[PDB]
Design brief:
The chain is mainly alpha-helical. It has one domain. A three-stranded parallel β-sheet has the order 1-2-3. The longest helix is centred in the middle third of the chain and has 21 residues. It is globular and about 45 Å long. The two termini are 20 Å apart. The relative contact order is 0.20.
Length: 172
């Protein structure tokens, strides 16, 4: 891993653990492996997506926020917003107690990471209905050119966006 990505991995483990969800570290590592294995065309799509990032990032999660992979989608979207220095709305369905807890967990992690990065624009894990959440996710992917599949694909793609943002930071 590059120093910047290793820094983010460690900061995420600290945030995951402090928020009471240390098991998310292993899940993130599986996403890191998937991103590192991405074919050239997927990397090219990630570079093109970063070029299309909006002034305010609006998205939603494609799976239930009471799952580890759903928490990770919300966290990674928040990380993309923080690294791009934009306000963000990350819609989630928070109807059941497990969903509300997952949204609160994602919010705690996202706030810790944004603070560690000095990102001052607001990034909010935002409770909404299924239609709003699904619409925002589809619009985000379509605006960026990212095909919408499963949570694994979205987590991989969001982490590839992160990697591109770090590459742009390093570039001259």
């Amino acid at each position: 891993l590059s120093p910047a990505l290793a820094t983010l991995r460690a900061a995420l483990t600290a945030a995951f653990t402090a928020a009471g969800a240390p098991d998310l570290a292993a899940v993130f590592d599986a996403t890191l492996a998937a991103a590192a294995a991405a074919p050239a065309a997927a990397r090219a799509r990630a570079r093109a997506a970063v070029a299309n990032l909006p002034a305010v990032l609006v998205t939603g999660t494609p799976v239930a926020i009471d799952t580890a992979e759903g928490v990770l989608v919300a966290v990674l979207a928040a990380l993309v917003a923080a690294l791009s220095d934009v306000p963000a709305i990350i819609y989630v369905e928070a109807a059941t107690p497990e969903q509300k807890a997952g949204a609160a967990l994602a919010a705690a992690i996202a706030a810790a990471i944004a603070e560690a990065l000095g990102a001052k624009q607001p990034i909010t894990i935002t409770a909404a209905d299924a239609a709003t959440t699904a619409a925002a996710q589809a619009a985000f992917g379509a605006a960026l050119g990212l095909p919408v599949t499963d949570a694994a694909g979205m987590n991989r793609d969001l982490l590839l966006l992160v990697a591109v943002l770090l590459e742009r930071r390093a570039a001259l």
